[PDB]
Design a protein around this ligand. Structure first.
Ligand SMILES: CC(CCO)CCO
Ligand SMILES: CC(CCO)CCO
Ligand SMILES: CC(CCO)CCO
Ligand SMILES: CC(CCO)CCO
Length: 180
């Protein structure tokens, strides 16, 4: 996409969970299930505001635990998240370190979703004892996402991706150039 960001409507991803998504990088939280997405897909860098992932909705499905490769299941449910946040390359090499010259993380995945625990998404997705998974994502209409956006936390905050057609398309827009 513009800026060299790797923004595809469907693909393979790794998945983790995190806490404290009330002041996320897009500048609005949301009450439904939300995620951070790796920087190369988010479309911005720390401190540069919202990227084009902001507000878009994705159906996530886990089907493997890379840390327990003999575990056969069960896995969790497929969930629909809204991207509100950035999982930056900095400090997240294992999962979110994808770049334009090296587009897969340490688990071989070209995307990562860090699912926020606070609002319930991770409890639907991760079986107890299995907090890192790999699987798939597909961008869907936000008609498929329950929830309400929070208010702007700063000028320039954006979740406009929530009404956009699936990638390829532009809503909030990408900021600068993707990490090389
Ligand atoms: C759970 C929400 C309550 C306000 O709608 C806040 C999550 O950001
Ligand atoms: C995390 C669970 C799904 C939520 O109902 C895994 C099912 O065992
Ligand atoms: C809140 C659910 C929709 C109920 O109709 C979706 C999340 O599980
Ligand atoms: C200077 C930045 C632009 C943010 O809109 C990043 C340059 O790559």
């Amino acid at each position: 996409a513009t800026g060299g960001y790797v923004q595809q409507a469907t693909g393979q991803a790794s998945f983790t969970m995190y806490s404290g998504c009330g002041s996320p990088a897009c500048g609005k939280a949301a009450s439904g299930f939300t995620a951070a997405i790796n920087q190369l897909a988010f479309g911005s860098a720390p401190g540069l505001g919202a990227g084009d992932a902001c507000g878009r909705c994705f159906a996530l499905t886990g089907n493997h635990d890379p840390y327990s490769p003999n575990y056969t299941g069960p896995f969790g449910q497929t969930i629909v998240v809204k991207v509100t946040d950035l999982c930056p390359v900095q400090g997240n090499q294992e999962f979110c370190g994808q770049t334009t010259s090296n587009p897969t993380n340490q688990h071989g995945m070209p995307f990562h979703f860090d699912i926020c625990e606070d609002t319930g998404g991770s409890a639907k997705f991760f079986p107890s004892g299995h907090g890192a998974l790999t699987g798939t994502f597909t961008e869907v209409s936000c008609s498929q996402w329950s929830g309400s956006d929070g208010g702007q936390l700063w000028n320039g905050a954006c979740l406009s991706g929530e009404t956009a057609p699936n990638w390829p398309s532009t809503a909030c827009g990408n900021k600068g150039t993707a990490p090389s």
